Write a protein that binds this ligand. Structure first.
Ligand SMILES: [K+]
Ligand SMILES: [Mg+2]
Length: 208
RNA sequence: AGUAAACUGAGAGUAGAGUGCUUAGUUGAACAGGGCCCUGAAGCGCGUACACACCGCCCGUCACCCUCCUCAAGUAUACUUCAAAGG
C-alpha cells in the first residue's frame, strides 16, 4: 500500500458530522478529537455522499465488472434496475385495485429482497478425516452469506443456458423470480440446506 | 491495490525480420475472515544403528559363485591292541 499504516479510512456520512455535540457521549467526543490529529486517506472514486448511493448495488456492480470496465458494468446495472421497474409498472397497470396494493414497483426494494431470499443460512466445509473428504455443515458468517447470494445470481445469469438474452433482461427476470421465492438461484440455496441437513451427523467433525 | 484483469504506445537489436524481451501510460476489481485438520517455519524438548548426512542406512530368501567344515549307505587304505596268558 502507498499509504502508511497511520492513514485512517475516510468516513463519508454527512449526518455523522452534523450530529449535535450535546448528544455525543464521552467516548464519541474522544473519537472526534482524536480524528483531528490523524492522517486520512483520499476518498475512493466510487462512494460519495449522494443520497442515491447504495453500497449493495455498488458491490454487485463490481462483481459484474470484467477487466476493469466499470462503465459497461454500471450500464448493465442501471438497465437492469430500469427493466425491473418497467416490468412492475406493466404488471401494476394490468392488475386490479386490490392486486395493485401488493405489487412492488421500487426496483431497489426488489433487488435487496431478492438477494436476501437467496442468502444461505448454513454452509458446507470440506474436512479431511482418515484420508476421506467430508462435507461438514458449518455456520456461515454474515459477509459470506451475502457474498454467496450475489455470486450465485451473477453465475446463473452468465450461464450458457440463456441463448442470446442480454444481461439486463436475464438479470431482471432472475431478480423478480428470486423476489417471489422462485427460480434456479433459490433452488441452489435449498440444495445447500438439504445437503447440510443430510450431513448433520458429520457436524461433530468440525473443531470450531 | 492503483495490484490482478483488460486495453493502448515506446524502446533495445537488423539492411530486413519475434505472437519474444524491456519499458511508459489508461480503465480498474474480488476476498483478506476463521483454522492448526493437511504442508512449512520459529522457540523449547525427545529419539537416532544416519555423517555421501532419509534420495541415509539396512535384513532375509532366490539366483550365481570361491574357500572351509559337518553329516552320511558302503567300500578301500593305513594305524592301535593280544603273550602283562595258559598248558
Ligand atoms: K538379497
Ligand atoms: Mg528410504
Amino acid at each position: 500500500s502507498r499509504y502508511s499504516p497511520e492513514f485512517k479510512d475516510p468516513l463519508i456520512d454527512k449526518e455523522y458530522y452534523r450530529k449535535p455535540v450535546e448528544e455525543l457521549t464521552e467516548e464519541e467526543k474522544y473519537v472526534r478529537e482524536l480524528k483531528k490529529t490523524q492522517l486520512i486517506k483520499a476518498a475512493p472514486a466510487g462512494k460519495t455522499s449522494s443520497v442515491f448511493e447504495d453500497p449493495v448495488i455498488s458491490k454487485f456492480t463490481n462483481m459484474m465488472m470484467i477487466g476493469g470496465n466499470k462503465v459497461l458494468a454500471r450500464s448493465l446495472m442501471i438497465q437492469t434496475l430500469e427493466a425491473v421497474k418497467r416490468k412492475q409498472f406493466e404488471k401494476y397497470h394490468a392488475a386490479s385495485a386490490e392486486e395493485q396494493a401488493t405489487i412492488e414497483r421500487n426496483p431497489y426494494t426488489i433487488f435487496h429482497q431478492a438477494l436476501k431470499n437467496c442468502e444461505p443460512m448454513i454452509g458446507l466445509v470440506p474436512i479431511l478425516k482418515g484420508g476421506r473428504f467430508y462435507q461438514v455443515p458449518v455456520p456461515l458468517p454474515d459477509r459470506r452469506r451475502r457474498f454467496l447470494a450475489m455470486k450465485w445470481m451473477i453465475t446463473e445469469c452468465r450461464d450458457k443456458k440463456h441463448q442470446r438474452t442480454l444481461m439486463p433482461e436475464k438479470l431482471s427476470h432472475k431478480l423478480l423470480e428470486a423476489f417471489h421465492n422462485q427460480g434456479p438461484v433459490i433452488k441452489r440455496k435449498h440444495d445447500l440446506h438439504k445437503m447440510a441437513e443430510a450431513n448433520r451427523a458429520l457436524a461433530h467433525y468440525r473443531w470450531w
